[PDB]
Amino acid sequence: MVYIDYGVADSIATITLNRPEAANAQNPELLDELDAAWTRAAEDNEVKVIILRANGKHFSAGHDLKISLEFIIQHEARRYLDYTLRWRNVPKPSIAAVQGRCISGGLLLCWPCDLILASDDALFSDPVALMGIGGVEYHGHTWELGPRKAKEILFTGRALTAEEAERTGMVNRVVARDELDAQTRELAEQIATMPPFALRQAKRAVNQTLDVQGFYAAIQSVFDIHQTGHGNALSVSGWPVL
Amino acid sequence: MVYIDYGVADSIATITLNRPEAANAQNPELLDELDAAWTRAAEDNEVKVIILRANGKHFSAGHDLPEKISLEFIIQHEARRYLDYTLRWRNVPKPSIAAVQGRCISGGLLLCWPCDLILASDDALFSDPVALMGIGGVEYHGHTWELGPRKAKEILFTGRALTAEEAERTGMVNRVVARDELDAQTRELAEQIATMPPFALRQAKRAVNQTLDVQGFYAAIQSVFDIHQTGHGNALSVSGWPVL
Amino acid sequence: MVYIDYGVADSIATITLNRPEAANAQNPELLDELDAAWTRAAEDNEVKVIILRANGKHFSAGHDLPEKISLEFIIQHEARRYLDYTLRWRNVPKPSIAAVQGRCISGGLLLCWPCDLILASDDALFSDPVALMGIGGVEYHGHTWELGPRKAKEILFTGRALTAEEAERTGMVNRVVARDELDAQTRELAEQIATMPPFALRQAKRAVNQTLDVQGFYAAIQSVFDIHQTGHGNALSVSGWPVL
Amino acid sequence: GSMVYIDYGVADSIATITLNRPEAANAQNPELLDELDAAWTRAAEDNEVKVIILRANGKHFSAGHDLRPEKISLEFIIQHEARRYLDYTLRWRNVPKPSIAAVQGRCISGGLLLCWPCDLILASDDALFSDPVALMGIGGVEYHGHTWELGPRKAKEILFTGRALTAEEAERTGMVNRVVARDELDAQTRELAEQIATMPPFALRQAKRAVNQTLDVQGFYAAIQSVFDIHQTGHGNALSVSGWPVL
Amino acid sequence: MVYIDYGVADSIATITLNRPEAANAQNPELLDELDAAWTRAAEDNEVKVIILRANGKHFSAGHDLRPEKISLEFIIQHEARRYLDYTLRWRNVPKPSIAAVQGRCISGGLLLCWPCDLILASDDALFSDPVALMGIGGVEYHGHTWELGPRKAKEILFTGRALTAEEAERTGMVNRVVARDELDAQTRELAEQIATMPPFALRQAKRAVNQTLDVQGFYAAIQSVFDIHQTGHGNALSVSGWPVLVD
Amino acid sequence: MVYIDYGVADSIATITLNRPEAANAQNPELLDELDAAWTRAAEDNEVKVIILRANGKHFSAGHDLRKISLEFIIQHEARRYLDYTLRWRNVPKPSIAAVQGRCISGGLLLCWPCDLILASDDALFSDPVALMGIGGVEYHGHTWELGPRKAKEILFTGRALTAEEAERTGMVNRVVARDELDAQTRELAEQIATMPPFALRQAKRAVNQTLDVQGFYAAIQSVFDIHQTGHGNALSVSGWPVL
Ligand SMILES: [Zn+2]
Ligand SMILES: [Zn+2]
Ligand SMILES: [Zn+2]
Ligand SMILES: [Zn+2]
Ligand SMILES: [Zn+2]
Ligand SMILES: [Zn+2]
């Protein structure tokens, strides 16, 4: 793998975004590698916990940017919707460690994790409105932030600090930048002492509550609204964005 | 009003589609008049029951089909006339009954589905072949609710017509009647309902419609409207026109 | 007890409405005895299946109708006997089968709808004409679930009865049978079901009921209970009596 | 542009709708509410308006519904309240452009129906939010935003006690987006509105829709309808006990 | 490969269950080859419609039942993959699919046809799920309540009886019933007719209906009942030491 | 009553857990007496508000654990851990839990069904039942009360939340000094009992019905079965209901 580093030790799989030269901007190849890494961790009976982390200053700058809407949907449904939900549902605990900028598409990498630790310098945003689109393809915003804060960041394009995100429940813990990796691995190690079936079913309990609340249906619903963004952009310019 | 007849007699308002020369195809002018008629009936205290019906052989052939049209522009117009109007009719707090004869095609379904009850003549044919134009069903997706998911997928995938008898079997149609008795049986039913206390009728309607909304009807209608709009998006991207 | 016969034999508990002289009309005493019967069957580990049936010609005519009566007073009584009892019967973790003959009117539906399966004689007639009294259907709104929304509105708006065959076509009735054969065929069905492992039956029942609750059944039943109470509220505000 | 009780102006793509009954602490009579609705419709239909600001003159945002026929039926009450307290409020919620409420001083009971349908809420540090309508025999106002905006435990707390939440308390539940100094409330609201108005209108429309449709899939429309009936049982009880719609 | 024939002709992909000597009973190898056929059909741009059919007298007798100490975890891991995830994946393939069901379709057989969009049944077809005999509350993917309504679903689960083609049609589970001799021909004719439609129209039509179902609670209910099914295996393990009940 | 104290004064019913010898761990007899106390309060027309509190240093250490089929376990747990809890939740009068010290696992089933929760500054809430092989307790308030990320964190790690952390998720209405908990709970109860009972009943209904429309009843039922797969697995591995 060119863009993703994978290691297993002490029952923990660590998946590292390794394209620091582009601020971990996501091309298709990177997303395919990342999905392969998640599947590896899912299928390795030695792995009890997964860490998602990133090299460099910034967790991820987002997606690396006649075209039909049909074509756009085919590609986005696979890599931005189905991959993300598949990661969400992997039956073992996962923790994202987020430093620096996590922008638009970056949210699709950390939101599917169960827990999020952020460094004090982390900044979460989704400014895709500038491009004519109503938020990224997988709409965690309302669930993670509450509707008022979700609209605030979509409408203004501003960034939320790590402490703001912690206040909405999107981030579990804010930690000093130099301690982010250490504190993440220590959490993962504590979780790995639990019986794997108990962790599987705890995760299932919370995620199934969310799905009964309408999470799956809402994610699908908003994916369609997202696609009208692209449809409008195409109708106006012939390009997927404004 | 040019296209819609409106009359009140014996506590009953009758709303009539009167464009038989175009098989009651729906332009914006007909829809704006139809909405004004629904409002008139809703606001007239002497009206207890509403009948929606149509002159001629066919109930409605559907929707009557700016250099660069934007999907934004399409959405604004369709959200007003095909979504908001339809839902407003659905929620009028008085019983309504649609009397459907002959062809009821695509947009025609948006006129009768918001009614509480539907009577159909034996010659009635219900269809939505808009897949032919590149779109996944009309703007207001009653299909799954009215027909069940398999029958909805069947008529959307094939563009075929359902008979009045087939529609009765799914529960979309309350009763099938002879063509020459359609108006008479509709009025007899309306009259029997109009003997009930208005507030009882209001809360019976509310009970069933609220059950539907709890089951997800409002949310699902809004959801499929966006799916519908991706159809227009795709067509605009391929041809520069809203349909294929 | 006074209004309800209870017996157990070959792993089947038979609960019989035994007030044929008032067409099994439901007063509080009868309902309390019925609830006690359901509970006794629920708690007896020898009972694998429950049959609910009725003596005389009619399953049930429905509910048998202090200075100033408050809405609060009505709510307290109705929440217990018409809402909580009915849901509790619904959730008893053993299969239950209602045998319905003749007229099952308004509150009569609260007795059979909570059973898992319903067998009806070919003379059975189901109705809810409570709109006549100013109310939007009975307290437990199974109508939309059992009949579909259009048929539910139809019977609430008109007060008309559905035959056994009409009810079977919506899925409310599992099987229509000759009047003379209703009991025998119910008993045989119970006996066949009682040969299954009790925990398989419990979880089959739970699978279906839980699908209903995810669909919104519990929430909708609670929502329409309030709509119903607005009926009593209006009747009180207009006459000082809970019904018009 | 303006009407009796509502001031209305457009400038730089922003429509500002101003409650203008400060001598009555913006108590809402039917006339004010019909005018407010007509203002929301004007801003919705005006293609030059990109963002809506809802604000209020005087010391208080709104004291709620104005208290000030032979036999009053529950039917009569439902007809009036369904129109002005349920249908108006939902329509404002659904206007396809961003809206921002600027809330100062008291926002009591029916006041909540004016700000809750806005997308964003900015509150001054002296803002106080409450719904003490339990004192009148009723289980919260007609449009039950409480559980969604505050969480169930806080919603029950304020309805059971009738107490006020400070602007900072409301911010912690996510009901208030930002708390600001009283003298800066108007300036900061305008500045936020101007920033939002630089965005493409269709991107804003679909962002708003994404969030509101998530809410509706979560059960928002259905729950609001459900609680409206619970509310009406309150009036039903009051009428049955006293012949008046409240205690 | 060994148990599944796959072919493409005139924009139609036909997947045939080819284990008639075991009444198309499903081992893991058959299920893996079946999932591979669905993926091959989904990924081929030249495929516009999918047919699922079966050789022999019977569509599928279901899961072929014939591990040191068996844990529930072990069963869940296996069933979640092949009975839940496969089935939902097939359900969501973004092209129309048609099942042609002849003869017996029992228990896990339902998992093969229920994910298809349309079902044509021969008049000889018999649908049943008698898995309560084994201690379990219906098969792993609970389409029963959706396809049949709750009273008919409970009836077939409580009794273990079969529904005729005609009974299934009356609940909406079967789209059409045809003569056993005409099943294959009528299915092909239906697929060709559908294959003349614009692929993106068909995709969004399928999506419109399936998304209505998921807003109604389909995905969440399927997940919820999966766990209820697993309590059946938990109980059986606790009573018989085996994943299903034995005499 | 052996384990539960019950008293009525000035329209307030006070229900006190009185098994400090086991940190108010819950056996079947304690749970039956608690359910009888809630029913008593529900039915007494002079009770307007209910307080649930606990003697000694700790609110409740959870279910008292000190061969069976899964069927047997489900029968017992559905009655006492699922049905009892939902019944308390739905009692048509305001209820307030006063929670001091440790509230562990099953303890949560006693306070969560209360409308409001006041906690002392030393209260600690946890659910470390993953240690026993089970995916959280039988009545899954966690996601509702804490949000999903915090719910997963406490179930995965087994750690305790402080009163102040619980307050930040909205699970706790107010944090008070230990010595003042009883007094602040009774004053809050007295204030609430000045309101019209029908208004309080319908305010309660409005919020709980919003929750049920959001999926609360359905979700609770769904997680019950997930919890029971915990027991099924434990039985399949160790012969016992836990690991
Ligand atoms: Zn995109
Ligand atoms: Zn259109
Ligand atoms: Zn009543
Ligand atoms: Zn009111
Ligand atoms: Zn299985
Ligand atoms: Zn347990």
Tab-separated table of C-alpha atoms in Angstrom, chain D residues 2 11 48 56 76 96 110 115-116 164 191 230:
chain	number	residue	atom	x	y	z
D	2	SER	CA	-43.787	47.432	7.293
D	11	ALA	CA	-30.685	45.509	2.569
D	48	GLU	CA	-33.064	39.205	-3.668
D	56	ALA	CA	-37.398	42.331	18.421
D	76	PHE	CA	-62.915	26.187	18.095
D	96	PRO	CA	-35.790	27.492	2.079
D	110	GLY	CA	-45.209	31.439	22.831
D	115	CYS	CA	-37.245	31.742	17.550
D	116	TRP	CA	-37.291	27.927	17.416
D	164	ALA	CA	-36.133	30.212	33.247
D	191	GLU	CA	-22.325	40.236	10.639
D	230	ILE	CA	-51.463	16.321	24.035
